[PDB]
Motif scaffolding. Sequence first.
Motif, short mmCIF file in Angstrom:
data_model
loop_
_atom_site.label_atom_id
_atom_site.label_comp_id
_atom_site.label_asym_id
_atom_site.label_seq_id
_atom_site.Cartn_x
_atom_site.Cartn_y
_atom_site.Cartn_z
N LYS A 108 -0.90 18.30 13.99
CA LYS A 108 -0.48 18.25 15.26
C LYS A 108 -0.79 16.58 15.86
CE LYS A 108 0.30 22.74 17.71
NZ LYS A 108 1.63 22.33 17.88
N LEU A 109 -2.13 16.18 15.35
CA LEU A 109 -2.61 14.94 15.54
C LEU A 109 -1.53 13.77 15.20
CD1 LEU A 109 -6.29 15.20 15.10
CD2 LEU A 109 -5.04 15.86 17.20
N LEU A 110 -0.74 14.14 14.15
CA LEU A 110 0.12 12.94 13.73
C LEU A 110 1.50 12.81 14.06
CD1 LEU A 110 -1.23 13.25 10.08
CD2 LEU A 110 -1.78 11.34 11.78
N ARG A 111 2.13 13.95 14.83
CA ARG A 111 3.38 13.98 15.51
C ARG A 111 3.83 12.77 16.18
NH1 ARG A 111 5.22 20.24 16.72
NH2 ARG A 111 6.88 19.16 15.36
N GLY A 112 4.69 11.98 15.42
CA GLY A 112 5.15 10.72 16.02
C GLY A 112 5.45 9.89 14.72
N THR A 113 5.46 8.55 14.81
CA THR A 113 5.81 7.62 13.93
C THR A 113 4.93 6.40 13.84
OG1 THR A 113 8.04 8.38 13.96
CG2 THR A 113 7.86 6.46 12.62
N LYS A 114 3.46 6.72 13.80
CA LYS A 114 2.72 5.68 14.00
C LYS A 114 2.31 4.84 13.07
CE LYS A 114 0.10 8.61 16.31
NZ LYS A 114 0.08 9.76 17.32
N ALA A 115 1.33 3.81 13.57
CA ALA A 115 0.78 2.75 12.42
C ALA A 115 -0.06 3.48 11.66
CB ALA A 115 0.32 1.80 13.27
N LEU A 116 -0.13 2.81 10.18
CA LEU A 116 -1.27 3.81 9.27
C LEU A 116 -2.71 3.53 9.82
CD1 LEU A 116 0.22 5.57 7.10
CD2 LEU A 116 -0.53 3.51 5.47
N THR A 117 -2.83 2.24 10.37
CA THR A 117 -4.40 1.88 10.59
C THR A 117 -4.72 2.62 12.02
OG1 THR A 117 -3.60 -0.12 11.15
CG2 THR A 117 -4.91 -0.01 9.24
N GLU A 118 -3.73 2.96 12.79
CA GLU A 118 -3.92 3.63 14.03
C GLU A 118 -5.00 4.70 14.11
OE1 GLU A 118 -0.87 4.96 16.92
OE2 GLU A 118 -2.53 5.46 18.03
N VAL A 119 -6.16 4.21 14.55
CA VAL A 119 -7.46 5.36 14.98
C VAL A 119 -7.10 6.45 15.84
CG1 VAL A 119 -8.27 3.66 16.51
CG2 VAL A 119 -9.69 5.59 16.12
N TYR A 138 0.91 -1.14 0.02
CA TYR A 138 0.02 0.09 -0.06
C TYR A 138 0.94 1.37 0.12
CZ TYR A 138 -3.36 3.60 1.69
OH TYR A 138 -3.92 4.69 1.48
N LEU A 139 0.74 1.96 -1.20
CA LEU A 139 1.87 3.07 -1.26
C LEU A 139 0.79 4.42 -0.99
CD1 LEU A 139 4.06 4.41 -4.31
CD2 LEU A 139 4.02 4.89 -1.99
N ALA A 140 1.44 5.46 0.00
CA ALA A 140 0.46 6.40 0.50
C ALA A 140 1.39 7.86 0.02
CB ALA A 140 0.23 6.37 1.76
N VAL A 162 -4.85 7.39 10.80
CA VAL A 162 -3.78 7.96 10.51
C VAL A 162 -3.86 8.24 8.96
CG1 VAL A 162 -1.34 8.34 10.08
CG2 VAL A 162 -2.33 7.23 12.32
N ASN A 163 -4.27 7.22 8.37
CA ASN A 163 -4.54 7.22 6.86
C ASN A 163 -5.33 8.40 6.50
OD1 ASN A 163 -5.47 5.26 4.21
ND2 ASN A 163 -3.55 6.43 4.42
N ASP A 164 -6.73 8.17 7.30
CA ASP A 164 -7.43 8.97 6.96
C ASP A 164 -7.12 10.47 7.09
OD1 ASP A 164 -10.81 7.55 8.36
OD2 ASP A 164 -9.24 6.83 6.65
N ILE A 165 -6.34 10.85 8.46
CA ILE A 165 -5.99 12.21 8.45
C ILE A 165 -5.00 12.51 7.28
CG2 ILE A 165 -4.97 13.79 10.12
CD1 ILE A 165 -5.84 12.34 12.54
N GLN A 166 -4.05 11.81 7.34
CA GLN A 166 -3.14 12.20 6.25
C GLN A 166 -3.81 12.85 4.96
OE1 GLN A 166 0.83 10.57 7.52
NE2 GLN A 166 0.08 8.68 6.08
N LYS A 167 -4.65 11.76 4.20
CA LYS A 167 -5.23 12.13 3.31
C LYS A 167 -6.11 13.44 3.34
CE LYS A 167 -7.68 8.12 2.35
NZ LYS A 167 -8.58 7.14 1.77
N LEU A 168 -6.66 13.65 4.37
CA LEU A 168 -7.53 15.02 4.43
C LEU A 168 -6.52 16.16 4.25
CD1 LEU A 168 -9.77 16.89 4.94
CD2 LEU A 168 -9.64 16.11 7.32
N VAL A 169 -5.45 15.94 4.96
CA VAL A 169 -4.35 17.15 5.02
C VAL A 169 -4.00 17.40 3.43
CG1 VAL A 169 -2.11 17.87 5.78
CG2 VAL A 169 -3.58 16.74 7.33
#
Lengths: 543, 401
Positions: free
Chosen positions: B254-265, A521-523, B227-234
């Motif tokens: 600000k909600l994304l600061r870190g190095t989290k999992a992509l599915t992490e709600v 999955y590329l993003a 995380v994916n959802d937010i990234q996309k919106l940004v």
Amino acid sequence: PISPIETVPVKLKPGMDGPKVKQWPLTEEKIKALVEICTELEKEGKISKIGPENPYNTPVFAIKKSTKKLVDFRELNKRTQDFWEVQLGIPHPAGLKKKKSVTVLDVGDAYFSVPLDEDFRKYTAFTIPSIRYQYNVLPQGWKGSPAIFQSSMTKILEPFRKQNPDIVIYQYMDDLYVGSDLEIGQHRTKIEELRQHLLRWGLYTPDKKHQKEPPFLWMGYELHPDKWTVQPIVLPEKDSWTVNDIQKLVGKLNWASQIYPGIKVRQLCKLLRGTKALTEVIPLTEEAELELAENREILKEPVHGVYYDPSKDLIAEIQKQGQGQWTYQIYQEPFKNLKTGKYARMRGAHTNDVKQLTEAVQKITTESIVIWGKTPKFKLPIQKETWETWWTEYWQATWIPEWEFVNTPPLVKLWYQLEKEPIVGAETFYVDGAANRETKLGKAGYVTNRGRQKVVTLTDTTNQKTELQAIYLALQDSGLEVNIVTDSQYALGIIQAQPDQSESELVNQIIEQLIKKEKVYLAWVPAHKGIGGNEQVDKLVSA
Amino acid sequence: ETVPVKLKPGMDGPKVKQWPLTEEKIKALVEICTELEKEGKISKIGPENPYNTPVFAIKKKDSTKWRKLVDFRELNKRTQDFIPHPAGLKKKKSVTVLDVGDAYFSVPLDEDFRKYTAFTIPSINNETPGIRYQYNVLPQGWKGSPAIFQSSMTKILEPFRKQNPDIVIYQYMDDLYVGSDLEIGQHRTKIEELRQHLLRWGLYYELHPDKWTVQPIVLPEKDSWTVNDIQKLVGKLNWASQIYPGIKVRQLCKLLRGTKALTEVIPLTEEAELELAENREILKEPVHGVYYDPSKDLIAEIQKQGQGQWTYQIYQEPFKNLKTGKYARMRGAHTNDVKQLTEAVQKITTESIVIWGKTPKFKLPIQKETWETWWTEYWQATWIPEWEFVNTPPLVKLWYQ
Ligand SMILES: Cc1ccnc2c1NC(=O)c1cccnc1N2C1CC1
């Protein structure tokens, strides 16, 4: 052989003006040759005497060695208006329809038989060294003679064409091929009607005794009125082989690849590497001796084809003959070909078999429309499902005319698919790449949600190169599933496009990793923003 | 008599070349062309005429009849220069389009300009030389025609205009644009009424302007964000920021600061909620101060969204759209990107006429060979716009989807 055909009005380019080139004072040895020549010529109608009024003049010559005249009109050519292009595209065997009979008249000195614009006529002046003459018919080698003659020819045939609609004529160069479905006597008779007709307008043609006989050779083929054939060509043998020698062989073998299968030129071609001169002699290698042999045999098999039958469907089938390479054949009756060909491995920046196949189809469709004014029904080595899947996921507009699947490996497929959504439980890599534009020094690398991370220095690189590198690394160092997030819309595009073939080493190394994985999955995310993860790598690939 | 006409300074006649046509299309052009010869409209020409423009044949709305169509795009650009477009038409309620190409056949063409109109009918498999002809009267598709014949046009339209002084008639090349506000029944008839009045001198699809706008951008509404959802919106938000500069994203990042999992709600702070609300509220209307400049060119860009959808935008200056929209489907050829793209092109050109009365310079997301091989198989207008081919970015589309 003077014609009673109206003339075509001509003019010199605007501003330009007739030639006024001097006249050589050559020996009277040739003069008497001219005097005579021109006299009969004169009284033949072709030329006429003149004098005081024509200030224009072009160099005229008399030639001995033919052991028994050559006017040069080059300067008049770059003066004459431009005419309408003469038919440049020509018939291909597979396009014709069968005939009972076919004859070819030879419009000999057709040229000299056609009048020249009385007006423009003057500028064709030339004087016989101590008589002033003017041309009255189309001169050899003058700009407009080809174009003008062909047309005049077209007119003269108009009536006759209307009255004998079952008859078919083809004008080419100094030739008239006429074929029909009448009986051998009737046909012979009609031809003679044409002769007289043409004869009627000052255009003489030899008779049935002094003719030319079937089959006829046409750009490689031998033509009978019922079918056609390809003369088995020959590949000489010897010890001495100049580069030039080898190049030619490649050429011949190359054209035959179209008609004959299993033809190869690789090892024979890998023989020109380094060559310093066309006269150079490369020692024929072994594989280049073995290959040169296989080809000789294959070339001994005869090849027979048939003509077009308007009351039948057209049908093309295509084959994947290795990467970038495709083969096709067109027929109307199973096994009985009309034409077949091959398309050399188009090589680009990045594509895939589905895209490639699409172009082959397009090329064939263009070809067909020109031969027959139709487009065949396609039979392809691709799944209907594969096609629907690509059709929806691809941005460019794409299409294929009516076709049907023909299971016949190797089929053409997609070597990998991208996930529509991220993966649960798969590692997540954030990758970046930066490179200076004045030193071309760069850094690639990543960071993940699993603690790990790597960076890498590069030399002689660029922004898009390093950016792609970061991705390779990530792909490289990970499980069978992965989530990758990059800020390069560039690299996204290339990949989003599911490519499977490319000239770049790196892209291929990546394509390979991609084919391997179980889920990818590329993003994408904007660059240099606050966005966590991206701002980590951002900092590590800078200096 | 014949009003003289010339090419601009320095210009020479077109010398484009003839594409090959299908059989069906050749036969039809011969019938069509012979007739016009009999009537003296056109004449066979000599090889001393070096010019040439391409031609082909189309089917219209639905007849079995074909129509000759000549691509004078080029000749038109080289022809010299010579009404003041009705602002009304656009603000109207119902415009019907009529084809008046005919009127031009009743008018002689200054014989000095005639050569320039030469064109050639091909022959299958090159067995036959092409058939060459040049125009003797005013030819459809040409720029000079509508001009030279206006004196006469108004003259004939004089009465009907007077009769119905609340209906607008705008002309474009071979087309006549008539717009009213009547009931779609006594509208359809007033037209016919004209069809006959028009047929007394001698000649022979309901649009709806009031609904052509600059459709608004929307944002996703979610149950729970990841995380994916937010990234996309940004990502999308950032884009739009260019048009609406007051759009913000400091709180969402600000909600994304870190190095989290992509599915992490992730849970939305009250700060992010605001940012969203505000941003949503800023996008409820087109941007301010966007006006049509007539000393510039109209441009039209199109994206393929899939499932039969296409989005477009008509603009003169980047990021300041004059209009945007989407074209889809209605019962037709179930799957043919090419057909769809052609239709789309026509729909857009039309508006650019209704509104501004000129054609837009297209940017087509397709490949030259594909486009040139088949577009004629589906064309239907008396006019033809200008265009180029391209490699669509990834965002651009994601943004308009
Ligand atoms: C070389 C060539 C080019 C175009 N057409 C033809 C030919 N020559 C033929 O011998 C021929 C053979 C079969 C069918 N048409 C043919 N003819 C047509 C004239 C009867």
